[PDB]
Amino acid sequence: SSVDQKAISTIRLLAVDAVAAANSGHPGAPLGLAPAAHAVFKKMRFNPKDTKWINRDRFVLSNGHACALLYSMLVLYGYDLTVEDLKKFRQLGSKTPGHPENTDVPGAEVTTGPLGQGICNGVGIALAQAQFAATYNKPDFPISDSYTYVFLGDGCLMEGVSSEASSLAGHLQLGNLIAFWDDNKISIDGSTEVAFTEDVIARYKSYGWHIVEVSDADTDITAIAAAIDEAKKVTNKPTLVRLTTTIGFGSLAQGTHGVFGAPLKADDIKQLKTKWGFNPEESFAVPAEVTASYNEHVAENQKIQQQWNELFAAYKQKYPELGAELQRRLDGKLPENWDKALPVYTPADAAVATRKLSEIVLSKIIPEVPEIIGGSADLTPSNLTKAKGTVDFQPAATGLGDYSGRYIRYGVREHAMGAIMNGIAAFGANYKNYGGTFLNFVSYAAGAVRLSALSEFPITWVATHDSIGLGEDGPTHQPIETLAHFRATPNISVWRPADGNETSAAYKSAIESTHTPHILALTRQNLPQLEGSSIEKASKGGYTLVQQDKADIIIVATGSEVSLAVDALKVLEGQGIKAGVVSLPDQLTFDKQSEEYKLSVLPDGVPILSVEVMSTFGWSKYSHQQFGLNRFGASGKAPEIFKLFEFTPEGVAERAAKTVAFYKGKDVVSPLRSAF
Amino acid sequence: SSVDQKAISTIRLLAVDAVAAANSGHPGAPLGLAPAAHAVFKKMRFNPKDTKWINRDRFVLSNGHACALLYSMLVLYGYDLTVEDLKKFRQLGSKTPGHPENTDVPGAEVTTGPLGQGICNGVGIALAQAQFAATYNKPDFPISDSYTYVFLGDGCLMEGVSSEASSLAGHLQLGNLIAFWDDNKISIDGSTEVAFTEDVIARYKSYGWHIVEVSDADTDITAIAAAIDEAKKVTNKPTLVRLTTTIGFGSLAQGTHGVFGAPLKADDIKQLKTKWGFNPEESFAVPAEVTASYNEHVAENQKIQQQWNELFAAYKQKYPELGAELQRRLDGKLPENWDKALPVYTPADAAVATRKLSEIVLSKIIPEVPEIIGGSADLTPSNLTKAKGTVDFQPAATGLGDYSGRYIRYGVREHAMGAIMNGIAAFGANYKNYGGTFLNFVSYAAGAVRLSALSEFPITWVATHDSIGLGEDGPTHQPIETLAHFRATPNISVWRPADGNETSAAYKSAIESTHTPHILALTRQNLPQLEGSSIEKASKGGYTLVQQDKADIIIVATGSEVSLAVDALKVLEGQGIKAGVVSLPDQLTFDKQSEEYKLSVLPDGVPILSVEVMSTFGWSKYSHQQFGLNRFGASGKAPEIFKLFEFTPEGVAERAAKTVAFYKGKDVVSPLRSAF
């Protein structure tokens, strides 16, 4: 009744006033979605004073431009966000950025705005919840029973990533996912009649979703609440709730593209306030009756969490081992000495492709670290499959797996895999999750990968077939630019291990990570075990593999090119040139080491040549001269392609000799030195 | 009857024998799709001796791994591809690469393999055909009436890019598009029951496609032909033909994932040959009766082209101006002196954002160059809209445009826009087409962008809001890595114009291009017109803006940072430091200039500092020290963000002074010098 209507008006006007203060941002969807936001938050279980309660319901604003709405909800419910923060919407350094960021905004589960991402993140939160519940729940112990609520608009529904994730979520029968479509006939691009005339509901039925339609979502909060109740009864399908709204509801300019993405006029804001019973002379008003009503819901939710804490204590008594495991995960700690399961190799061991070494690592650590789950997309089972002793993550109704399973069959859906991985990480409970594909097609998921970095999520791409070393599939499949792209993105560890020990170091980093996504670039072709490699040294990101105190040159290399550098060293010896070799399996980890450590690897006074069979971009950080591949590849047997491009011991040696000659009579300082 | 069955067996066995010779590749889909390929090619109009006939039907193999099938068709029809080339499938340097490449394979319209791309390319070929026909056809002059036939598999149907393009193609009522789904219950990832249980047909109906189902596509070529006839009657919908096939049909391992992507066993190939009436001891057999039957179809198609040539001659007589325009386009030539329409500016003109300058260029050149069409995705109309005097490309039935229109409303579909642009370019007829979005979300289309480069297509991204200069939308929207990514990709011109004259040079390059895709990185914020800029100098990619014969330092910059460098020069003068300024609007164009020209811009004997407000990757090609932004951005007013990161005249000057001091007493040679 009346306090609910007052709350809705309060939300609407807080959002409009925030946009007005910034003179920037998006008032239309906040106005249109305030009734639904009020109704959904009243059904959600959450604690503003404990944003990490593991059995909270999660909310995701996929239409992230509408974040003045989210911030208004968080303020009204007493999260660590205030009206003073709302006044600083879109202002440098504020807690209310123009699109919501999980690192900066209390109560933002994920970073959204780039369209399509949030709904996929919601799929991942729901996937994680189902896996977590299957792992821990017991009779009389509903440790995990929470829902995932997502708001999304027409823009998200046009982005292909959301189609991928929605097809998969329907297949996975994710009944605790409840998404709400803001059916307002507008996107950033304009009216939907211009480019978006598909039958959305028919499409979602084709994916196996349940549908509820709310024809008057501008006012009918009773029907929105009833739609949630209906969705909760359908336990084997995700639900799409069609919210037919007027964008900018209440504005003089309601129902037009003009209210999508620009501040309202001042006189429009005045008439909004007067017709909803607010003072047109006042901004950022919060009626105390609204606060009281919201506080009551918080207090009830806090009593639910208090009871959950007692359930968890009783669970530890009845299921001591599972309880201790759950506690450890909620504390953010891996199993003690888990890394003793990492395989270790010697130079007497056989050559192995780093793809195969990686799969061996996973097979050893998955049984020991329950919070590891993962999967693959656009990749044959022979290139990655589940660890022996596990099953696929599937609804049991299919007969193909169980929600307790550990390996996700993403289908040919790289981009959704990337965004779903972000949602699994966002769930919490120490999930360390991975996704396998070919390195060249990690690029299909760039939108999500960048968000892994910005969101500080410890996700891992298992990215095989890293180079021309894959051979016959040819230039359509062979990375050139890919490592440069991701190394140039802030906060991405890009491991390119050369051998067995380096591959174990790469996984130690990826699994221990709490704030940095990892990409592991792995080979189709076999590589030798290196003399001088170890987990310890490779864990520094870069290390001296072959030390030469009288070096004429140092060759720095990664991955498959480290063995090439070692072979080139022998050719150079016959030419009277003494070389050292540095292996640089992760540039980010190396960069984070001390200046003195880094200089011990890349000293002053000696020319340094890099060797890596893809783009030379970035390599001047570490080298004076760069031997790389800055053209597309070729379709043939891999050794013949390496020969064609002179990535041979003799070709490296020739360039090393030319490098020595180029610096004769010159003073050479480490590439690590800088003017500023 | 019998020759048709023999042809199908011939196709199947050529494909299997090609895979066998390579001991690599994909026999399953060629076996399953040979009946459909035979039926479709028999309905297609094409000339193996003139692959560029503008009224040919086009074929696209979206499931590009199946290319042994395509190559077999091209060989049998007498394209410039032989059995000897088939024997060299997947061999270094051959005309039969492991995935088809338009640059290397006669009769390959586009480069496919990366899943989802080809169907989107087909949408673009069909879009171009509709626009072309609307522009040129007249009563009794069907200059353009061709169809676009696409084969695609389950993998393509899972990739989100194909959903985007299929939604849009349905909206656009593209009745000359006929796609065929290889419904074989397999993808690269395994059986479709595992991850792909959606109702594909219901989804395609929701997009507005027509459906024809062929339940026995292993044998029923009569029904496949009838499906094509049915599709041609439905002139206002694209058609999806469901081909229910057995992957690997005929193999001992038919209907299993094992035949998807590995060579068959030798004994399996023997039994295939014997049961189809071939000699199991023989490989690469081509029965002369098959050749005769295919030659008859070629001869009929050549008579159709001969009549088309006479129609075109009669068209030139009746419609002299349109006929001459069409001839010019088919000759690959732009209008004479078209570039006189490019806007020119002086330093007395007002400051303008390069986004606005770009839109002004388009508004002036679109009316003068009929082969320019383009559109936008995920971008408000205020940031890009159609040129004044044109209409949107829409089916007239909608009332929202016409097929003669010039501006495509792609919706929020960046990746499909990128792949559709490739298809428009592939159509030919000198189409110079563009697609607008925010630079940060060009990354959503990386799969297609890379293929623009590999395919050598002259497409153009109009990529606004290039940096932290966009301000309040914040780090989710602000590029950091994006230019480095695309500059590191072979064959991409990445223009970052600083002012009006540079923006005109960028368009001169983009429109004149025949083999190189362009990305134009453009500003939200206003920039001054520069003293020293011109179309002539900027057309060199890099040029000396401010020459200083006694320079202590040269500052090289792009885009918004050129004006910053000029302001820093004045600060430095007060510190007793003399600087020159270089503007580097396109690194690729610059790299292609003569060594002497490049050294005149970046000489020996002077320290060089780069300034660009994003990643420093690549910049060591042109500079000794680099001032960039290697962290994510911020949400606030843009000038405050620049100040925060010290991209100010004083901050640049400080780093320039430190650079001068760092090189005191050192011998400095141009960054352009190399040891090899």
UniProtKB/Swiss-Prot annotation, chains A, B:
The active site is at residue 414. It is an enzyme of class 2 (transferase). It comes from the Eukaryota. Mg(2+) binds at residues 154, 184, 186. The keyword Calcium applies. GO terms for cellular component: cytosol; nucleus. It catalyses: D-sedoheptulose 7-phosphate + D-glyceraldehyde 3-phosphate = aldehydo-D-ribose 5-phosphate + D-xylulose 5-phosphate. This is Transketolase. It comes from Scheffersomyces stipitis (strain ATCC 58785 / CBS 6054 / NBRC 10063 / NRRL Y-11545).
